[PDB]
Symmetry: C2
Subunit: 271 residues, 2 copies
Amino acid sequence: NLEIGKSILAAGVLTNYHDVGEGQPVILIHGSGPGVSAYANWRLTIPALSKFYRVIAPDMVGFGFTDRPENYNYSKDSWVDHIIGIMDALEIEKAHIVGNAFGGGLAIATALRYSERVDRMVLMGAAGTRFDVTEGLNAVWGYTPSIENMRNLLDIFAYDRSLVTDELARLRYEASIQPGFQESFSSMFPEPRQRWIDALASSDEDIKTLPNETLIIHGREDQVVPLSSSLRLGELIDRAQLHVFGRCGHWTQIEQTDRFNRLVVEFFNEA
Amino acid sequence: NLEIGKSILAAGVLTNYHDVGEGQPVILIHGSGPGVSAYANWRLTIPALSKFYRVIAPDMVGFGFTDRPENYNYSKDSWVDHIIGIMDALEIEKAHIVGNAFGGGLAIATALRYSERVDRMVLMGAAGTRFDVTEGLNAVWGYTPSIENMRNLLDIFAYDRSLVTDELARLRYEASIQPGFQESFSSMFPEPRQRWIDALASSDEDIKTLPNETLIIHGREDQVVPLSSSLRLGELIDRAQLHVFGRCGHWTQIEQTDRFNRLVVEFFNEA
């Protein structure tokens, strides 16, 4: 399974992660869909970025192939602790961070608690500001295994549904039923789910204090996280740029791959 | 005067223009401030783009060093005719177009009337959709010559006012009082000025028919054309991307020069 990479103890948790490239460190933080993993989310991003940076893509605790501690208390702060633990384990003193949705919320939270450890940030269809739960988000977090349910989720993520093939739905369905996966996932964001959007978000006041050069990316047609959320982040963060892709859903790094990779690399090249 | 370039008869009007580079044609259309010219607006853009494209930057009739015909009837359609006349004069059958504010409105109007003559479009703080007149816009179009009035206009355009020096205000003031300049300018957008925003705009219905890959750029702090106008264009144009620069006013190609040039070049490189 290519989603399985290297292993390292971070914040007391055995963590699965990928580490490719040399130079300035860049941490990629995946989203929160069923069966999600760093590799699944970033396989088309890592190759492009690793040509100029050292790319670290870890499976957040509770997701992918990282250990799922018994009675583990999942929370924004614990996930931030995990990210910092990973950086500490790898002697990464400061790094840029790219966060996808759920991961974007964690990126913001990490920059607020550990400002000196975070350089530039790329927030893609990111959580971080309170917004009313969408049917798309409730479908994703409320997922129960089945090829039809996975096909529906992939459709929710995609702008061009022609990309959602029976094979892809089958492979992600299989990833979602791996031992312990659906168990940790279903217990993560139970109803009412608005509670978790609110808990993962950061306050307007706090976000305004972010000193980091930031690149906010969003797909116009995103059915999971509304475009309005990124527009808000664009008003709150001072040194920010907003890039909205038309004809693109919540699958930005997948449906606008080359454009996304180019924007990110050039953005980091400025540093 | 470096603002004076080559001369060519276009749409029956002797036109001042710059032509640099080889390959795929790109037409740059300047804005509508007092003393504006293609060179003044694009001097920091032409060098970057001309390394990969053939860049044509003409002074629109009524502006710069292009002839100002007696009793000439200035209008959206006449300006479109001028743009097409310039392309015809240079045997430019199809080209990409970059339009700054007023010029962005003309770009849209040209793409609607001569769809087959326009390839990709870059709309920067562009006119094209109806929006309520701003104090900044009324100050620009209501300008009367004086170094203090020019300093005020430059301040309105800039995010970082430290860029507005006495020397720059003096040079643009001098450009604004050249023979015939203030005369054609003041008669162009007389009060009430909302009439001209409306006349230069294109309908929502028409804009939705644009098939062109389009890149919409806007400065978050723009005091002349509200960010909301570009957000609207971003909802109307199908194959569109929106890029908003924080800490940037209506002087995008000047205050975010390298970022702007890179985005534009990569955008055209895709074609």
